[PDB]
C-alpha cells in the first residue's frame with residue numbers, strides 16, 4: 001500500500017542524499033538561490049522550484065500521500081534543471097546522473 005511504497009521512496013531519498021552520490025547530487029541538496037548564483041531570470045523560467053531538502057521536509061511531514069506524488073516532485077526538480085540550462089552544461093550532466101540513480105531504484109518499488 002501507499003505507506004509501504006512511501007518507505008521505499010524514503011529509502012531512495014536517503015540514498016540520493018548520501019555520500020555515495022555526493023559528487024553529482026550536491027547541486028540538488030537545497031533550493032536554488034537564484035540571487036546568489038546571479039540567475040536573475042530563474043523564477044521567471046522556473047514556476048515550481050524543487051530540491052531534495054524540500055522533498056525531505058514533505059516526506060517528514062507526511063505531505064506525500066503516495067509514491068506517485070513523491071516521484072513527480074523528484075522529477076520536477078530534474079526537469080527544472082533541463083528547462084533552465086543548455087543541455088551541455090555540467091549541471092545538466094549531474095542531474096542526468098542523479099536521475100538515473102533515482103529512476104532505476106524507483107523502478108524497484110514493491111507492490
Ligand SMILES: O=c1cc(N2CCOCC2)oc2c(-c3ccc4c(c3)OCCO4)csc12
Nearest residue numbers: 027028032033037039080081084085089091
Ligand atoms: O539549474 C541550475 C542552474 C544553475 N546554474 C549555476 C551554474 O551555471 C549554470 C546555472 O545552478 C544550479 C544549482 C546549483 C549550482 C551551484 C550551487 C548550488 C546550486 O548550491 C550551492 C552553491 O553552488 C542547482 S540546480 C541549478
